[PDB]
Amino acid sequence: SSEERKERWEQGQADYMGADSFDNIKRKLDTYL
């Protein structure tokens, strides 16, 4: 949950199938452009 996801990113266990997939990153980045 949020900060825990950042921790998992830091230790190298990313959820590339679920919440950490690039869909979230792209939908957040699309606000700046």
Binding site: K6, W9, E10, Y16, M17, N24
Partner: protein, 620 residues
């Protein structure tokens, strides 16, 4: 002909260009040469508003960077502020042919901010970086420092100019991402020289180019523990005003893995004037290669050297990516064809690919020494005979040919003849392998049966070490040796842009490339009937491995069947082709990309007309 000031007349006014890259004044790979060569035309176009931003290294600074003082008050204020805020920024000239201004950022002096900055990135793009990468953290620090510098430069400017930033890899994409995050008034361009997943997928995974639409890039990126790097590159490509790739094949690869079609393709160029400093150099180099093969093949010189052809392949020791296996199989097939048809041609192939060696073997040095001894003996006897002939001819008498040779001459020649006795066959490698059992080139040579036998019409020489002018047995650098060869075979499989085939073509040497490489696609697109110009494009994208080997064998056999006049005409046509790879022509795509970025970011002040006009019509 077509120069920079042809049709792109643009209102540059007060605009500043920042050429952000991880590899300025710091030699790592191949884009270093790209930036170093492009700086001249970029500075001619932009004057003194051109800055290259890069990391600070002690070696590079002491070798090729001349530290100076900031030429503008805004730059001096920015440098002083950043240096007093806890950073370390240097300014100077890059001692290259253009002499451009360089801003160097020390990423080792800003570790204290990492724990903060790493958080901010997550509070902006939900991207995390594992602590143990040790190479992505440098990218994060470099990107935050670059964004800081750009923001401070815009803040300290009395009149705010239009800033164009150009980032060149995933190592510099964090700066672009943060520039778009903070909504700075900048125009961002992103250039990819090779997609990150491509080299991972080519090795191991099968049929990379036949499954570009069946790749779930998230899964392969995550499984290879490079998910954060992939997210960095894809985020940088996504939020950029203009996206670019260096080749068409890279354009398809990025469109299918980065999920964004490039707005433009900017190929890599080079300065051809230095290479041009072609038959005198070719003749001299061919004579020296003839001498080397005379030395190597001593005691087995039973073939005509006026009918021998010199092929070569060079580059990094990538067996599959550089297409050496296809070359070896085609060489075996061509050997069979040459033997069956009863030809007088001979083909000596060279494999200049660095490996892990220690020293030369005894046979190669022995052959070079034997050749030197024979040459010296022949010259001695020749000079003595010439003196005797002149003396006997000045008195008006025909030389008695049965007395021009005396006892010491016969002694020298008998020793020389005794020197050239050998029972074995010449080696296929000139060094001592440290992994002779596990070497793929030697394994394939043994498997296909090329042992430099007398009946073999194809001889093979594998020379691991780089060609150097100070080598004991090849006292010549790479360029002069290459100028004497007849053909260069580069059947590359994975190659975003081919520096070696392009360098070979600039020197005027006919070459074989593929449509799976950037140079091959470029030459295929810009030339009609490339084979008439000496460029043989191998259809490797729509063919199997065996079909590719058969086509390569056909190309080699058709090259071997030309007459001498046809070869001369082909090489002249190849020589008149170097201007297609110069930055004087290839630098216009960068100008167009910058114009697109300026018009997209600031549509009020600039407007772009999409003129994509930019050649060799012959035969076909």
């Amino acid at each position: 002909p077509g120069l920079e000031d042809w049709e792109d007349e643009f209102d540059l006014e007060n605009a500043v260009l920042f050429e952000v890259a991880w590899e300025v004044a710091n030699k790592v790979g191949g884009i270093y040469t790209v930036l170093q060569t492009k700086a001249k035309v970029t500075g001619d176009e932009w004057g003194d508003n051109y800055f290259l931003v890069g990391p600070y290294t002690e070696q590079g600074v002491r070798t090729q960077v001349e530290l100076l003082e900031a030429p503008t008050p805004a730059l001096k204020r920015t440098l002083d502020s950043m240096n007093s805020k806890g950073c370390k920024v240097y300014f100077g000239r890059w001692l290259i042919e253009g002499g451009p201004l360089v801003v160097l950022l020390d990423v080792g002096a800003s570790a204290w901010a990492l724990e903060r900055w790493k958080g901010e990135l997550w509070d902006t793009c939900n991207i995390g970086v594992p602590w143990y990468d040790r190479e992505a953290n440098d990218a994060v620090l470099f990107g935050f420092l670059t964004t800081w510098f750009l923001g401070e430069f815009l803040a300290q400017s009395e009149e705010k100019p239009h800033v164009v930033a150009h980032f060149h890899e995933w190592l510099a994409g964090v700066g672009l991402c943060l520039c778009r995050a903070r909504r700075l008034p900048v125009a961002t361009i992103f250039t990819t020289h090779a997609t990150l997943l491509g080299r991972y997928l080519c090795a191991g995974a099968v049929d990379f180019y036949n499954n570009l639409e069946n790749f779930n890039v998230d899964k392969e990126a995550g499984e290879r523990q490079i998910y954060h790097r992939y997210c960095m590159e894809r985020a940088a490509a996504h939020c950029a005003h203009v996206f670019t790739t260096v080749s068409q094949i890279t354009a398809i690869e990025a469109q299918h893995l980065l999920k964004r079609k490039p707005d433009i393709v900017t190929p890599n160029g080079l300065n051809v004037k230095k290479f041009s400093a072609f038959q005198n150099l070719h003749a001299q180099s061919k004579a020296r290669i003839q001498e080397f093969v005379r030395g190597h093949f001593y005691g087995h010189l039973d073939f005509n050297l006026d009918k021998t052809l010199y092929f070569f392949i060079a580059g990094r020791y990538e067996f599959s990516n550089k297409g050496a296996d296809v070359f070896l199989e085609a060489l075996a097939r061509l050997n069979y064809l040459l033997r069956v048809n009863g030809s007088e041609q001979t083909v000596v192939a060279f494999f200049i690919m660095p490996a892990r060696t220690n020293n030369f073997n005894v046979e190669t040095l022995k052959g070079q020494a034997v050749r030197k001894q024979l040459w010296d003996t022949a010259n001695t006897v020749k000079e003595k005979f010439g003196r005797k002939l002149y003396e006997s001819l000045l008195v008006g008498s025909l030389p008695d040919m049965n007395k021009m040779l005396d006892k010491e001459d016969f002694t020298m020649m008998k020793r020389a003849i005794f020197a050239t006795q050998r029972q074995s066959f010449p080696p296929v490698c000139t060094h001592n392998m440290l992994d002779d059992s596990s070497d793929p080139i030697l394994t394939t040579i043994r498997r296909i049966g090329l042992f430099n036998s007398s009946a073999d019409r194809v001889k093979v020489i594998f020379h691991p070490e780089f060609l150097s002018s100070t080598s004991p047995l090849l006292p010549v650098d790479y360029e002069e040796f290459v100028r004497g060869c007849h053909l260069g075979v580069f059947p590359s499989y994975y190659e975003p842009w081919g520096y070696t085939p392009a360098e070979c073509t600039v020197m005027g040497i006919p070459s074989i490339s593929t449509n799976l490489s950037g140079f091959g696609c470029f030459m295929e697109e810009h030339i009609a009937d490339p084979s008439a110009y000496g460029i043989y494009i191998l259809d490797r994208r729509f063919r199997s491995l065996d079909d590719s080997c058969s086509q390569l064998t056909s190309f080699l056999y058709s090259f071997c069947q030309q007459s001498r006049r046809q070869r001369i005409i082909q090489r002249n046509r190849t020589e008149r082709l170097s201007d297609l790879l110069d930055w004087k022509y290839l630098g216009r795509y960068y100008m167009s990309a910058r114009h697109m970025a300026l018009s997209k970011a600031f549509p009020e002040h600039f407007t772009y007309e999409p003129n994509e006009a930019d050649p060799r019509p012959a035969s076909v």
